[PDB]
């Protein structure tokens, strides 16, 4: 329902930064081209994080912005005779490349295009994988639906590539880390510890994402989701169409690593337990230096996060691993809210944190998004602790009064 | 694994052994990847003549362009009147984007507000929005002034925004008398640049257009100052300064430089500073008008020449010796106050570090790119300096612009290698510096990455960027230079003498090697 | 061999193939050469904890020290008042080195003579030298006042300057009322800022010891401001500017901005600007005196309350937040005036730039060095920050300085792992950022073989040097900084806070290897 | 003679500069101490560019500062036990060394101390060669006087180490470059052409100089003297005790260069003179290209030396092959005389190029000594060529007049 109403300020985003910015974008070894004028691929270009091991411009391409830059013409003739010309230059000019996927700005739906048609005679011509999404950004109310046409369009054009292919090698324990972005390199984070659990994670997709990766997906006896939010769409129905069961995971904090990861172990026999627990024990000592170090500057610190209530209806994480005291919005302003509530820092909702710094409020979430990471995982922790510290303590948030007055 | 003691991020983190062997078995077992000589070998590929040729024959395909879209440029013109409050008429998602990107580049909060038409507004047009947008936004945020602009959305189903905000002021959604002055942005055509042409032009118009007969060229003895797309602060105060310094009254119409730079003190001031009404209002009755960024700035001349008569003088950017002697020269003919003692030994001062500096300037071949009047400007400037500029680019230029700088190379000895390109991005740009090797880039944080591709070809083929221009990321209050005047021509001619100089220091610090070279004195 | 077309300077030209041979023949056949094995085994040993004991144990030798001779800092004194020329009693040589020393670091002509005493004055003493010196002098240069010093060889024979200078104007050598202060500059005591200290007294009793029954302390409503030892232009204008902004009237005495930044336009100025005799003898009439550098500027603050009457205010050097915080407060309590809206709004720009910047700067190791004011003002700030403070060194510190800056370090949580050394050289702070490396230097140019000394080890052992102090060589223009105040704070941070950066982005530059972390924005 | 009055401006040296600044300092195996109050050596500390080859602070110490630092204490009871105990701390923390040197401040002669002395009981004590030299600043009236000190030095303590061994394997075309002080790697470039020619440079002293190649000086059959007016002393001393002639020799254009290699080759039989042409034919076109280059752009260029008429008494060398106009100071001001006649550059003399510049006249003379260089041999005229074009051409020289008067 959601009342967000126009004249007002909010740094929502639409359903194009969602297929284009977290879906689709961190694919690395496919070309995605912003379909429509200029400006939405600029100001989208690495604007997120998501980490990944190429060579940019040869074989990876994440950090780069195609783009068909609509001029006048395209959009009183259609930009559909171009779209196929550009598919030819993208390529000569980057041969490299593993496919290439067709994200679609506001006006390529207004005046009337058909992308689909671009995709399978170039797609046939080509003999590669052209995928058309159309998440022009008025569609829908946030970023949201952009999620699940991006969703929608891994099923229909990626997906089931190898229905009928059979030559794959798998094993008991392969798995599939879906929606997670590698901000910061998170996904490297955790794939770290599922592996010295005995795991094979097979998939890892969107974060380091591969095209061949996604198709294997369909392979695997478990699918694990970090972000339900954007990829539950995508889960539910590889349920159905294979019958492959998924489940949530959080490794924010010891806490919440050491509980999911039990958890996941618990699906599988028992050399696996076994193999979580030598995991588990392995980091010990490790955490509790971190909670040693931070917990002593960092207790009684109130965190304000974006949840309904005075409190979570379960532990967040990270944040009580280090003596943190959690706060929630209420039941329901907000600027004058959080003066009156005086938190220590906001952990999530209402983006912008440069209003926050203005108003003497660190804003540092659950995720990297700027400049540390990664914060999830054993490793991450740490990382995690420190930025907390650093943050919080910074004498600059002391120095907000000049002493005249 | 982690040492509390000295914990590492993603970097170097990443980098142990733990962490290279993960990546190994992903890598090789499931990623399909390309051998890693086909990826050198391809890689090489891009780096040659023959990919080049093939590179500059794109009709369709752009590959990192240098150049945002239009509303983006009105929002940052609107911006600089007091209390008032960008409006964009359209799709939430740019407004998302255009404040995220000035976030980035400024580091300050941006005011702005979208009506967030979805899909109904797509068919029955975004009447509605229009009105429910105007009445919340001067409820919530109290504005004086609502400048409207829009995203591509609402030019493609040509929604009109005179009647629109006509009808809104009819059926009392807002005031009759508040000012809600609007402008097409068009996101298809030009660049941000033309944005804050047409935003500027139209809030000029709604001031100015019906009144015309009660004014005269003279009464208030000002000159009208229009900036034009800065994003350099420095630049709104040293040419506020200098005029200030030659005793000449002035109104700088549109100057953000109090919101984009708001102090840190517990309160957050969502209004600062800026143009006044008054001041649009009586801004015909000044002697003249002066253009600093005249490339851009087109369309609002034609109206300042063509509604206030005034004779606009023909002014390059002030950038540089040359051009800042002319603009001051003429800023003192137009108001008959001298150039003071003062200017004469700030301008004497420039010409003192150009010669302590030239023997590490002089022939140093320059790449660079930015905005149409940001380039001419810098270009003129290298010249002064003895430098050879080789790769002149500007994607969102024209064809008469071009003949503008061509014309300038010629008139001096050191354009001999230069070419100027337009309507080419920075993947032909990534081309150009492999095949004709330039010492440095000037350019803004998306030059990164050409440095990195350089690079990886070998320290002998790497290119340095120098960071100057829009936007500017991955550095902190670079935001805060000058760019304009003496000043500014002081601040870039330090940063590219030390840039020299960092750079040869690298290239000489290898014990009993190169070191040899390694000079205290330089 | 050379191209014409790109012809090569020694680097790289001595690295073709035809020297590189002709090098390792020389060296081979008739250096006697040690075993490049044993050069590096002797290397590697000089990086470790026992080398830096045995070098911490050093008594009679000096090896890199960090600081000048005294008469360096009273010639920089006496050329901040108007139309004086520095003169120096001694050995020819001694002013050779001194211009030299000042023209690579300003950039500037430096006006200094000497009466060159051979061996004849060797034992018949310098009196003669000093007469014909003083005539030619004031008749060469025609100055109105010539402030007199003495090299190390007059300190030794022990020539009486007092009597020398009488005897000249007594058998009529120069007029009788002609200024000719003096003082005794020993260079082997203190360093180059008690030299300022000396000569700046020297000059402060000439025209005010014999005639204080006259003055009134008030009388001229004015604050004195005492610079001591600076060598950034910047600073002089910083603190001017701030006090003509709060309406404060002051006297700056001892003003060298002008002199050490002479316009080029044809003409060579001798002279420039400067404190006006008149403004030496009218300053005990002011209300107070303010020593932007208290701890070298100690002979001078006992003239000042013993004769003067004025009640020095206790203020460290205004640097840093705080510190600006207080001078400001005591100056606006002193004089009355209150701080403007227009400080309090820089002073929030400043906490604006620090907390955008924080999470960049807390935590990282520095290792510093340079003069006992400015280090520890560096010290305050760098706490700040939120970083750490590792290796303060100071070669001319003293025992009383260091309980200073240890307390300042016990007053935050920031100064853990930091310990200061006095009367300490540069090669044993070279030791200390190898057994104990902090991420960066701050120091002068001589800190660049520390950096090329680290880096030979290994790309990550090297610790890169920021060039903040004096002297400067290998960089141009960084003498027009600003490193005081609310200016100056910017000015520093954003040197810290981009060094950061740019070897972040150094670092992360390679292909498919470390570039994961390139990140656009930072 | 010389009536340099006192009381005027004047960038003369003192001894000491003359002995620490060009005549030992160069010496890159031995560790130099200047012996007095801390200014000095700082001042001095890297301050001209005789370039070299070593690893700094363990083989080569060219660049480092070692002094005494006197207090007053020192300065009271002498520095003779301190001088002691300084070499001692030498030897263990620069053990790699081959020799110490002792260049005396100003102080050193007044209060007496016999530095002679502790060179002879500490040399004799830690087998070193340590050379004692009496440069005290206030000595003579320019750095001349210091450099016949230095060169008295290196005659009594270090050339004649070898006088009685005969282990040395020479050959008829030994020859020695002395006084090149190999600024901006000058000797270099010229060591390179007499290699080319057949000659086999066994002693290159002072820039990039050896210790062991000052003693083998005696032991070769020509010495080549760049630097006259330094080296001379020592040059005809070498006559006397061992009987080896002496040349002078210039490299500084190809005229020159040419002149003095045929000159040179002559001093040998016909096979030297016969090489000395192909090296003169290899590097004709290459010179040429310069001078094709940039006569043109230099051409009617007049350059002031500070020599005695209007003219010099033969060719200066590189600025004739580039067509310029070399003028004279006359036969006697000198501020006033250079406004007058309005040179386009000064190429030498009454140094301190900082106040040329406010004057709008240009300084760079026959040696690199600040930026660039080599400026001789062939390599080093094409260096040359280009920094007189950008000196001259440069167009700031055109900016001192602001266009509104
Ligand atoms: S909502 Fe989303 S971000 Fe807006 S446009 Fe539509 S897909 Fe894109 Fe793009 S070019 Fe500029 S920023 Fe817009 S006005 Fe058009
Ligand atoms: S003339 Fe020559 S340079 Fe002068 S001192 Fe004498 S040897 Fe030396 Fe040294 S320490 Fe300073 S600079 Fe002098 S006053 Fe004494
Ligand atoms: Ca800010
Ligand atoms: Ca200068």
């Given at each position: 329902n959601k009342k967000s109403q126009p004249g007002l300020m909010t740094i929502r985003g639409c359903a194009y930064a969602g297929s284009k910015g977290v879906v689709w974008g961190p694919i690395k070894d496919m070309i995605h081209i912003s379909h429509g004028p200029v400006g939405c691929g600029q100001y989208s270009r690495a604007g997120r994080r998501n980490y990944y091991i190429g060579t940019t411009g040869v074989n990876a391409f994440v950090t780069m912005n195609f783009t068909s830059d609509f001029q006048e013409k395209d959009i009183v003739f259609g930009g559909d005779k171009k779209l196929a010309k550009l598919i030819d230059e993208v390529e000569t000019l980057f041969p490299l490349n593993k496919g290439i996927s067709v994200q679609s700005e506001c006006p390529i739906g207004l005046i009337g295009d058909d992308i689909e048609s671009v995709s399978k005679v170039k797609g046939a011509e080509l003999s590669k994988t052209i995928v058309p999404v159309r998440c022009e950004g008025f569609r829908g109310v946030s970023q949201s639906l952009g999620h699940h046409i991006a969703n929608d369009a891994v099923r229909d054009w990626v997906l089931g590539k190898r229905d009928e292919d059979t030559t794959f090698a798998s094993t008991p324990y392969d798995v599939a880390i879906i929606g997670d972005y590698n901000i910061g390199g998170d996904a490297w984070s955790s794939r770290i510890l599922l592996e010295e659990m005995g795991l094979r994670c097979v998939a890892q997709w969107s974060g380091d994402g591969s095209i061949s990766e996604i198709e294997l997906?369909?392979?695997?006896?478990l699918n694990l989701v970090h972000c339900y939010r954007s990829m539950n769409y995508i889960s539910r129905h590889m349920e159905e169409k294979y019958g492959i069961p998924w489940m949530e995971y959080n490794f924010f904090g010891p806490t919440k690593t050491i509980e999911s990861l039990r958890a996941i172990a618990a699906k599988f026999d028992e050399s696996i337990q076994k193999k979580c627990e030598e995991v588990i024990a392995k980091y010990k000592p490790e955490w509790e230096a971190v909670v040693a170090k931070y917990r002593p500057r960092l207790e009684g610190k109130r965190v304000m996060l974006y949840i309904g209530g005075l409190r979570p209806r379960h532990v967040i994480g990270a944040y009580e691993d280090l003596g943190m005291e959690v706060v929630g919005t209420g039941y329901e302003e907000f600027e004058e809210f959080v003066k009156r509530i005086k938190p220590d820092l906001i952990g999530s909702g209402i983006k912008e944190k440069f209003i926050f710094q203005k108003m003497g409020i660190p804003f540092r979430e659950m995720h990297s998004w700027d400049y540390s990471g990664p914060y999830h995982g054993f490793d991450g922790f740490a990382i995690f602790a420190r930025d907390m510290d650093m943050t919080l303590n910074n004498p600059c948030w002391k120095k907000l009064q000049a002493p005249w007055e | 694994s982690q040492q509390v003691d000295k914990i590492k991020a993603s970097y170097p983190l990443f980098l142990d052994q733990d962490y290279k062997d993960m990546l190994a078995k992903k890598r090789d077992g499931f990623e399909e990847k390309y051998p890693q000589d086909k990826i050198d070998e391809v890689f090489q590929w891009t780096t040659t003549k023959e990919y080049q040729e093939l590179n500059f024959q794109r009709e369709a395909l752009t590959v990192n362009p240098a150049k945002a879209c239009q509303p983006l440029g009105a929002v940052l013109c609107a911006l600089g009147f007091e209390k008032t409050m960008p409006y964009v008429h359209g799709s939430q998602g740019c407004v998302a984007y255009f404040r995220s990107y000035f976030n980035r580049h400024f580091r300050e909060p941006v005011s702005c507000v979208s009506d967030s038409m979805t899909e109904d507004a797509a068919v029955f047009g975004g009447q509605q929005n229009m009105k429910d947008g105007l009445q919340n936004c001067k409820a919530t945020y109290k504005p004086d002034m609502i400048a409207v602009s829009t995203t591509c959305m609402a030019e493609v189903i040509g929604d009109d925004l005179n009647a629109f905000i006509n009808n809104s002021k009819k059926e009392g959604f807002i005031p009759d008398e508040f000012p809600v002055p609007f402008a097409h942005t068009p996101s298809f055509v030009g660049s941000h640049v033309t944005g804050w042409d047409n935003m500027f032009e139209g809030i000029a118009r709604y001031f100015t257009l019906k009144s015309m007969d009660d004014k005269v060229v003279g009464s208030n003895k000002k000159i009208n100052i229009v900036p034009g797309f800065e994003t350099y602060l420095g630049n709104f105060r040293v040419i506020k300064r200098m005029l200030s310094e030659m005793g000449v009254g002035y109104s700088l119409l549109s100057d953000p430089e109090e919101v984009l730079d708001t102090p840190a003190d517990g309160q957050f001031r969502m209004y600062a500073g800026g143009t006044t009404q008054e001041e649009m209002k009586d801004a015909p009755n000044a002697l003249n008008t002066v253009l600093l960024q005249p490339w851009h700035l087109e369309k609002t001349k034609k109206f300042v020449e063509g509604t206030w008569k005034h004779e606009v003088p023909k002014l390059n950017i002030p950038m540089g010796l040359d051009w800042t002697d002319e603009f001051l020269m003429k800023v003192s003919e137009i108001s008959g106050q001298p150039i003071p003692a003062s200017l004469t030994k700030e301008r004497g001062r420039l010409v003192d570090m150009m010669t302590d500096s030239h023997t590490w300037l002089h022939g140093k071949r320059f790449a660079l790119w930015g905005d149409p009047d940001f380039v001419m400007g810098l270009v003129k400037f290298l010249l002064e300096l003895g430098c050879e500029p080789v790769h002149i680019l500007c994607h969102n230029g024209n064809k008469r612009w071009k003949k503008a700088v061509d014309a300038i190379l010629a008139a001096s000895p050191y354009g001999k290698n230069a070419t100027v390109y337009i309507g080419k991005d920075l993947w032909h740009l990534r081309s150009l510096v492999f095949t004709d090797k330039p010492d440095f880039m000037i350019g803004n944080s998306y030059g990164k990455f050409i440095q990195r591709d350089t690079l990886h070809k070998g320290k002998e083929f790497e290119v340095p960027l120098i960071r100057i221009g829009?936007?500017?990321?991955?550095?902190?209050?670079?935001?805060?230079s000058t760019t304009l005047g003496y000043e500014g021509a002081m601040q870039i001619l330090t940063t590219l003498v030390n840039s020299i100089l960092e750079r040869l220091d690298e290239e000489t610090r290898g014990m009993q090697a190169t070191d040899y070279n390694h000079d205290l004195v330089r």
């Amino acid at each position: 329902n959601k009342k967000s109403q126009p004249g007002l300020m909010t740094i929502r985003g639409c359903a194009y930064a969602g297929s284009k910015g977290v879906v689709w974008g961190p694919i690395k070894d496919m070309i995605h081209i912003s379909h429509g004028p200029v400006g939405c691929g600029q100001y989208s270009r690495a604007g997120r994080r998501n980490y990944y091991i190429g060579t940019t411009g040869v074989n990876a391409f994440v950090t780069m912005n195609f783009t068909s830059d609509f001029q006048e013409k395209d959009i009183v003739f259609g930009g559909d005779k171009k779209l196929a010309k550009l598919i030819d230059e993208v390529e000569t000019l980057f041969p490299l490349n593993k496919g290439i996927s067709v994200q679609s700005e506001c006006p390529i739906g207004l005046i009337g295009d058909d992308i689909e048609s671009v995709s399978k005679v170039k797609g046939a011509e080509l003999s590669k994988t052209i995928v058309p999404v159309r998440c022009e950004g008025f569609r829908g109310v946030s970023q949201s639906l952009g999620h699940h046409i991006a969703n929608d369009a891994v099923r229909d054009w990626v997906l089931g590539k190898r229905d009928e292919d059979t030559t794959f090698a798998s094993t008991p324990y392969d798995v599939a880390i879906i929606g997670d972005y590698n901000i910061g390199g998170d996904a490297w984070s955790s794939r770290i510890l599922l592996e010295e659990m005995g795991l094979r994670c097979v998939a890892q997709w969107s974060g380091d994402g591969s095209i061949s990766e996604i198709e294997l997906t369909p392979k695997v006896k478990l699918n694990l989701v970090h972000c339900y939010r954007s990829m539950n769409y995508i889960s539910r129905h590889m349920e159905e169409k294979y019958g492959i069961p998924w489940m949530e995971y959080n490794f924010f904090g010891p806490t919440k690593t050491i509980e999911s990861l039990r958890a996941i172990a618990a699906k599988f026999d028992e050399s696996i337990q076994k193999k979580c627990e030598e995991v588990i024990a392995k980091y010990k000592p490790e955490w509790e230096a971190v909670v040693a170090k931070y917990r002593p500057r960092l207790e009684g610190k109130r965190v304000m996060l974006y949840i309904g209530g005075l409190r979570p209806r379960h532990v967040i994480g990270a944040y009580e691993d280090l003596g943190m005291e959690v706060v929630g919005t209420g039941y329901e302003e907000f600027e004058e809210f959080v003066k009156r509530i005086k938190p220590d820092l906001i952990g999530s909702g209402i983006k912008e944190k440069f209003i926050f710094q203005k108003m003497g409020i660190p804003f540092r979430e659950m995720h990297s998004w700027d400049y540390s990471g990664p914060y999830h995982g054993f490793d991450g922790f740490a990382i995690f602790a420190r930025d907390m510290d650093m943050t919080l303590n910074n004498p600059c948030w002391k120095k907000l009064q000049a002493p005249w007055e | 694994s982690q040492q509390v003691d000295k914990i590492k991020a993603s970097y170097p983190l990443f980098l142990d052994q733990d962490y290279k062997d993960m990546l190994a078995k992903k890598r090789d077992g499931f990623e399909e990847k390309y051998p890693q000589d086909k990826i050198d070998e391809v890689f090489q590929w891009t780096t040659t003549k023959e990919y080049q040729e093939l590179n500059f024959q794109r009709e369709a395909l752009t590959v990192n362009p240098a150049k945002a879209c239009q509303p983006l440029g009105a929002v940052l013109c609107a911006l600089g009147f007091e209390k008032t409050m960008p409006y964009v008429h359209g799709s939430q998602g740019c407004v998302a984007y255009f404040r995220s990107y000035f976030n980035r580049h400024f580091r300050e909060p941006v005011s702005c507000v979208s009506d967030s038409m979805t899909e109904d507004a797509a068919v029955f047009g975004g009447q509605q929005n229009m009105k429910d947008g105007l009445q919340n936004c001067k409820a919530t945020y109290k504005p004086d002034m609502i400048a409207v602009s829009t995203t591509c959305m609402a030019e493609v189903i040509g929604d009109d925004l005179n009647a629109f905000i006509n009808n809104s002021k009819k059926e009392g959604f807002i005031p009759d008398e508040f000012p809600v002055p609007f402008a097409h942005t068009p996101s298809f055509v030009g660049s941000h640049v033309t944005g804050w042409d047409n935003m500027f032009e139209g809030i000029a118009r709604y001031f100015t257009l019906k009144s015309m007969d009660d004014k005269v060229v003279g009464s208030n003895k000002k000159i009208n100052i229009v900036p034009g797309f800065e994003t350099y602060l420095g630049n709104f105060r040293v040419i506020k300064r200098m005029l200030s310094e030659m005793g000449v009254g002035y109104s700088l119409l549109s100057d953000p430089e109090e919101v984009l730079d708001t102090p840190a003190d517990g309160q957050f001031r969502m209004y600062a500073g800026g143009t006044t009404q008054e001041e649009m209002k009586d801004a015909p009755n000044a002697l003249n008008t002066v253009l600093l960024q005249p490339w851009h700035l087109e369309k609002t001349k034609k109206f300042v020449e063509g509604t206030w008569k005034h004779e606009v003088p023909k002014l390059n950017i002030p950038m540089g010796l040359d051009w800042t002697d002319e603009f001051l020269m003429k800023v003192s003919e137009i108001s008959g106050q001298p150039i003071p003692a003062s200017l004469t030994k700030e301008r004497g001062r420039l010409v003192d570090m150009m010669t302590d500096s030239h023997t590490w300037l002089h022939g140093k071949r320059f790449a660079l790119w930015g905005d149409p009047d940001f380039v001419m400007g810098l270009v003129k400037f290298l010249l002064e300096l003895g430098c050879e500029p080789v790769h002149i680019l500007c994607h969102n230029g024209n064809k008469r612009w071009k003949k503008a700088v061509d014309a300038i190379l010629a008139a001096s000895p050191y354009g001999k290698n230069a070419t100027v390109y337009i309507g080419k991005d920075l993947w032909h740009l990534r081309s150009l510096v492999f095949t004709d090797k330039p010492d440095f880039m000037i350019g803004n944080s998306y030059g990164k990455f050409i440095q990195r591709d350089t690079l990886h070809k070998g320290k002998e083929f790497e290119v340095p960027l120098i960071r100057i221009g829009f936007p500017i990321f991955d550095r902190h209050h670079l935001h805060r230079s000058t760019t304009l005047g003496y000043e500014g021509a002081m601040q870039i001619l330090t940063t590219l003498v030390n840039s020299i100089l960092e750079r040869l220091d690298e290239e000489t610090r290898g014990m009993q090697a190169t070191d040899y070279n390694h000079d205290l004195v330089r």
